[PDB]
Task: structure prediction
Amino acid sequence: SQEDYTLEALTAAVRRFEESEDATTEARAAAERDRDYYDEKQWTAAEKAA
Amino acid sequence: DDKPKHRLWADYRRRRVRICEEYYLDGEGWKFCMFTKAGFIVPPMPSPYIGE
Result:
């Protein structure tokens, strides 16, 4: 009844959040890389170690 | 096709559908249809929008 409806609503909200998080993983990574480049972090760990 | 390609989840009830709204010039005048690949949504009727 009410418990089932609440569980379904919570599952729908969590699924919406997970869809938003996973569907934009590459875009988020690219934006974070751009922010790091703007923030003086322009060298990767491997290249810096080399 | 839909954008973007996200993996389907069994517990997810969100479903995406595609509709086609077509205006075509028939022998008598403009007609407007709303359909899918399965069946009509709005049957072929004269366009409800009035021109010049």
